[PDB]
């Protein structure tokens, strides 16, 4: 729990903060990312939110593309099991 490996375990995947349009996607289908790497930018009620990488795991897949409307708490990125 102190090791912070737990911080990765607390949530399996990053979800959409609110229902909003996807304005930017910074990750390809297979991309190596480190914690704090921005994955997507979403505007909700004219308010910009940037999604950030939870783990250093490589990205297995992306559930949304640019211009898509993503509902609140819907998975945005799939990460390869390690």
């Amino acid at each position: 729990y102190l090791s912070s490996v737990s911080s990765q375990e607390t949530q399996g995947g990053p979800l959409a903060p609110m229902t909003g349009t996807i304005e930017k996607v910074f990750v390809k289908a297979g991309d190596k990312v480190k914690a704090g790497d921005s994955l997507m930018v979403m505007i909700a009620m004219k308010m910009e939110h940037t999604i950030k990488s939870p783990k250093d795991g490589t990205v297995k897949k992306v559930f949304y593309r640019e211009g898509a409307q993503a509902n609140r708490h819907t998975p945005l990125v799939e990460f390869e099991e390690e």
Partner: protein
């Protein structure tokens, strides 16, 4: 046993990132702007007025405070920007009065000194409000009040806004009488002329000190005496230290000069037979694990961008240690327990739009703090409430009201810090000025108004688009900005921190790097009064 290892908040920001570079640059400019404006206010009336003031043998108002407080002790000044551009053609630096909290003879006291270099010390409408705010702070925290009296009376051209009403000049004496009845010492130091209502201040004080020749006290000034009775008498003869000290008896102590009077004041406070007692548990202080100046890059000046409030918390609490409460429920609101300079604090901060879950989570947290007598700190960065047909059907208003009602009834000391926007009912739920927080501070990037400037513009752009679509005369897009641009300008101007601070809506604009120090001083002062039991109203379940 306190040896348990625990997790700590905060992360290292990306200093190389363009966003951090831009945010730091913008926030730094605001802080520099704030600093230089205070420097100008520091000079009061000006060189000619200051030279005249010293030529009479009197100390400058800020030098008086420096000599009054303990050597090297910090001084927490309040409402430095009162009266900033408030009046069309008159410059009133600091409102003509200097108020703050400092340590005298080891006791925290409220110091209220007239600035005689500003309009001769006349009382403008903002001057009365600033003094009344200081008295309210002193009473709520049981801080002895020291009045360095050097005043020229009320400003006649604006008498209707000074004399008559409940919160007008008359309330000043009412506050003195009430505090005296509660054993909150009232000490007046007449270091200049005081006329009409001014003469009441030394008379209403528990103990009083007057300078040998500078000080003068009289209900009616020489000009009124001549008009009423046709007699010519000097101010010293009509008032003066000797007359009051030896004949009238209004004076309790007689002082040779300003330095002597300040020395006497320190002796008076030392005889108050007061000792501070703490109701809360105390733990050794620890510095935060991250630099405070990083707040410049993290926060910036663009309210449209969002940041994690936990980053702000990580840089002000002891050791960056924070126990979050209901972390995964109502995540738009952050609540948890921490310590600042050893004091326990419950922190409530906005991290997005308020929802029904967020309001419920806040209401639960506030009850916990009140039960354990833990001071509360609010970090307002709001953008409104959730808007939707479903949310109203589920009683979002009912949930939002739950928090307004819990926050109002809480009796633990409350301090509010506006680090972002403050709009609509979100202000009330987060302990706005109307809810009597012990102190309220704002960062230089804050904005406050009934609603955001854009929302008012867009709302009107619906009403008149409707007005002409429904009426039938077409209303074009260029007609839209002849509607929207004046509204946005008005809300930007009236939501500016200086506009809010010029009037006394907050207790000051503070540099983000100074947030931890200001909070530490404020909470320390607020602990001078015992914490009472909280009585709640009906919780509309």
């Amino acid at each position: 046993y306190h040896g348990d290892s625990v997790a700590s908040l905060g992360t290292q920001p990306d200093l190389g990132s363009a966003l951090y570079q831009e945010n730091y640059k913008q926030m730094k400019a605001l802080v520099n702007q704030l600093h230089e404006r205070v420097e100008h206010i520091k000079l009061g009336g000006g060189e000619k007025a200051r030279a005249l003031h010293i030529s009479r043998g009197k100390l400058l108002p800020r030098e008086r405070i420096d000599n009054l407080i303990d050597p090297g002790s910090p001084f927490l000044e309040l409402s430095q920007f009162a009266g900033y551009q408030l009046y069309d053609n008159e410059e009133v630096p600091g409102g003509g009065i200097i108020t703050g909290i400092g340590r005298v003879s080891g006791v925290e006291c409220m110091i209220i000194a007239n600035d005689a270099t500003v309009k001769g010390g006349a009382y403008y409408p903002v001057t009365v409000k600033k003094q009344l705010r200081a008295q309210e702070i002193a009473m709520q925290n049981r801080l002895p009040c020291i009045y360095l009296v050097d005043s020229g009376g009320a400003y006649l051209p604006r008498q209707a806004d000074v004399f008559p009403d409940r919160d007008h000049f008359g309330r000043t004496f009412y506050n003195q009488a009430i505090m005296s009845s509660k054993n909150i010492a009232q000490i007046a130091v007449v270091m200049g002329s005081c006329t009409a209502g001014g003469a009441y201040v030394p008379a209403m004080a528990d103990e009083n000190i007057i300078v040998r020749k500078q000080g003068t006290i009289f209900l009616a000034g020489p000009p009124l005496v001549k008009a009423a009775t046709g007699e010519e008498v000097s101010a010293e003869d009509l008032g003066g230290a000797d007359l009051h000290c030896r004949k009238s008896g209004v004076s309790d102590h007689w002082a040779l000069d300003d330095h002597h009077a300040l020395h006497l004041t320190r002796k008076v406070v030392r005889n108050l037979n007061y000792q501070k007692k703490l109701d809360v548990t105390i733990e050794p202080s620890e510095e935060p694990l991250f630099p405070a100046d990083e707040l410049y890059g993290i926060v910036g000046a663009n309210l449209k961008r969002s940041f994690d409030v936990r980053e702000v918390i990580a840089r002000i609490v002891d050791g960056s240690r924070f126990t979050e409460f209901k972390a995964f429920y109502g995540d738009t609101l952050v609540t948890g327990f921490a310590r600042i300079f050893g004091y326990p604090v419950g922190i409530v901060g906005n991290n997005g739009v308020l929802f029904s879950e967020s309001a419920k989570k806040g209401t639960h947290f506030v009850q916990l703090c009140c039960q354990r007598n833990i001071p509360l700190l609010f970090l307002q960065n709001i953008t409104g409430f959730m808007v939707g047909r479903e949310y109203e059907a589920e009683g979002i208003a009912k949930d939002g009201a739950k928090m307004v009602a819990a926050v109002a009834c809480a009796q633990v000391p409350k301090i509010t810090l506006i680090i972002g926007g403050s709009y609509g009912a979100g202000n009330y739920g987060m302990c706005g000025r109307a809810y009597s927080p012990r102190f309220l501070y704002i960062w230089p990037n804050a904005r406050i108004s009934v609603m955001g400037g854009e929302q008012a513009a867009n709302v009107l752009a619906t009403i008149t688009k409707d007005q002409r679509a429904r009426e039938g005369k077409q209303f074009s897009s260029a007609d839209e900005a002849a509607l929207k641009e004046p509204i946005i300008k008005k809300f930007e101007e009236e939501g500016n921190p200086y506009y809010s601070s010029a009037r006394v809506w907050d207790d000051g604009i503070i540099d983000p790097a100074d947030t931890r120090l200001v909070l530490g001083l404020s909470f320390s002062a607020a602990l001078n009064a015992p914490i009472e039991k909280t009585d709640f109203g009906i919780f509309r379940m």
